[PDB]
Amino acid sequence: NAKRGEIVDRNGSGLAINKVFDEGVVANIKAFSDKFFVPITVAELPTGAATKDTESRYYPLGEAAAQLIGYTGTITAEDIEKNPELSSTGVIGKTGLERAFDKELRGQDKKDGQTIKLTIDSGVQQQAFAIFDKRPGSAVITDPQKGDLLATVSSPSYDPNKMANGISQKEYDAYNNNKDLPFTARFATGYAPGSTFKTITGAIGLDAGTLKPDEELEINGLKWQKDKSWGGYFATRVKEASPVNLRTALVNSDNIYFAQQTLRMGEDKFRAGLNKFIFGEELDLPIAMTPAQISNEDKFNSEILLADTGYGQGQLLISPIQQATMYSVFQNNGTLVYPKLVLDKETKKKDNVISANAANTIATDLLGSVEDPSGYVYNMYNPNFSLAAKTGTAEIKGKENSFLLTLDRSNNKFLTMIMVENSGENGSATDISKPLIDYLEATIK
Numbered sequence: 236n237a238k239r240g241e242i243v244d245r246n247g248s249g250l251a252i253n254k255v256f257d258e259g260v261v262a263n264i265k266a267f268s269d270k271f272f273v274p275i276t277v278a279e280l281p282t283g284a285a286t287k288d289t290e291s292r293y294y295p296l297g298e299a300a301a302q303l304i305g306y307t308g309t310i311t312a313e314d315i316e317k318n319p320e321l322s323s324t325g326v327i328g329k330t331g332l333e334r335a336f337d338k339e340l341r342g343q344d345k346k347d348g349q350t351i352k353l354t355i356d357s358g359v360q361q362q363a364f365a366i367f368d369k370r371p372g373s374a375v376i377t378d379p380q381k382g383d384l385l386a387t388v389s390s391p392s393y394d395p396n397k398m399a400n401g402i403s404q405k406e407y408d409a410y411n412n413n414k415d416l417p418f419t420a421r422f423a424t425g426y427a428p429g430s431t432f433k434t435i436t437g438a439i440g441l442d443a444g445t446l447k448p449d450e451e452l453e454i455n456g457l458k459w460q461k462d463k464s465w466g467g468y469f470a471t472r473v474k475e476a477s478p479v480n481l482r483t484a485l486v487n488s489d490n491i492y493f494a495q496q497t498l499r500m501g502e503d504k505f506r507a508g509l510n511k512f513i514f515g516e517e518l519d520l521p522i523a524m525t526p527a528q529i530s531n532e533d534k535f536n537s538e539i540l541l542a543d544t545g546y547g548q549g550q551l552l553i554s555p556i557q558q559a560t561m562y563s564v565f566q567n568n569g570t571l572v573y574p575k576l577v578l579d580k581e582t583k584k585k586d587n588v589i590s591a592n593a594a595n596t597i598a599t600d601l602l603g604s605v606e607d608p609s610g611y612v613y614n615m616y617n618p619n620f621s622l623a624a625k626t627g628t629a630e631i632k633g634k635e636n637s638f639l640l641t642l643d644r645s646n647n648k649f650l651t652m653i654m655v656e657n658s659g660e661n662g663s664a665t666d667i668s669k670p671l672i673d674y675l676e677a678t679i680k
């Protein structure tokens with residue numbers, strides 16, 4: 236009987252480890268149930284009860300990292316009849332990294348399982364989970380220049396220690412009957428990026444030459460369409476301002492400005508620049524994801540969809556992890572940095588996804604979201620720290636999702652991608668994210 240390997244964080248702190256507990260049994264079942272060898276619960280005894288020192292799989296961060304780490308279980312009859320070397324009372328990973336790394340972690344019952352060290356920072360993981368407070372959402376924090384996944388959070392969550400060691404049918408049905416679905420790994424689920432995506436459309440415009448950062452576009456009204464052929468669809472903005480240049484459009488969230496710049500460049504110039512990103516790519520992460528997509532077809536076949544895609548709507552599906560990877564070009568002078576989860580994995584990059592001038596131009600104008608008093612992220616303003624940010628929402632056809640992207644511009648050591656589902660009921664991502672941004676500005680700097 237070999238010991239299961241440990242999953243540890245970037246500092247060696249435990250994420251999936253082993254711990255000895257003093258657990259059970261070997262009218263009497265009701266007498267045992269009305270007071271607290273087959274273990275039951277962790278510890279003058281009823282008839283049939285006993286205690287023993289059993290080693291159990293333990294997760295220190297608990298629900299804070301449940302979807303990422305996953306849980307283990309007994310080797311089912313269907314599990315052993317699928318591979319080789321399986322004990323009747325063995326332990327196999329059922330989900331998360333406990334499954335994806337199960338081969339390395341279980342060993343052979345005799346060499347012990349190997350220890351896998353991750354990029355996760357436990358302190359960041361716990362902070363990033365604590366801001367949600369049962370709200371449905373996700374948070375992806377990364378080292379933008381190296382790809383390190385410092386945290387991958389999905390909310391709501393579940394207790395991984397009970398699912399692995401002993402959970403009642405009532406607690407499991409409560410987890411399954413949750414409309415928010417705590418078992419899903421929202422950081423790996425594809426969503427529309429929302430207004431935050433305008434950063435990338437802006438960069439693509441700067442490089443294509445059709446978008447001038449100092450050009451003063453005349454925009455009047457709260458809604459705009461190319462002509463009558465658009466029907467009832469309009470590009471809408473929340474505040475009236477004119478004339479609008481690149482910096483003011485990014486601070487005021489002006490879809491009319493970016494719809495016009497997207498129609499100005501055209502589907503070909505827009506797709507030329509989008510294709511340099513990781514659309515369609517399966518990544519090397521041990522997390523299962525559907526590749527990001529631009530639209531359902533190879534061509535928009537619709538000026539409405541072309542403009543809609545310009546500000547993160549339309550048929551865009553990008554997961555939070557893939558969104559973090561795409562947005563890393565602003566902290567690497569246009570170079571994209573793939574995400575890594577294992578700490579000793581080499582950093583993988585994709586050179587010149589956008590130009591260095593376009594990356595820095597966008598990144599500089601995004602300081603206004605935090606530093607200008609009228610900006611939407613002014614609540615997190617800090618005179619001693621350079622932070623660029625960009626809020627955004629995405630309407631799903633009568634619900635909205637809230638997105639917040641922040642970039643460390645003092646040392647380019649962190650990047651955050653936060654999402655709150657059903658933001659009309661659960662609030663924006665900007666309203667809950669300040670403790671996370673403050674925590675990261677002090678730790679990661």
Ligand SMILES: *C(=O)[C@H]([C@@H](C)O)[C@H]1CC(SCCNC=N)=C(C(=O)O)N1
Binds near residue numbers: 429430431473487630
């Ligand atoms: C993105 O650009 C969205 C649009 C695609 O729906 C707009 C709308 C929003 S917020 C308007 C409703 N909430 C008001 N408090 C913005 C944004 O700044 O998040 N961009």
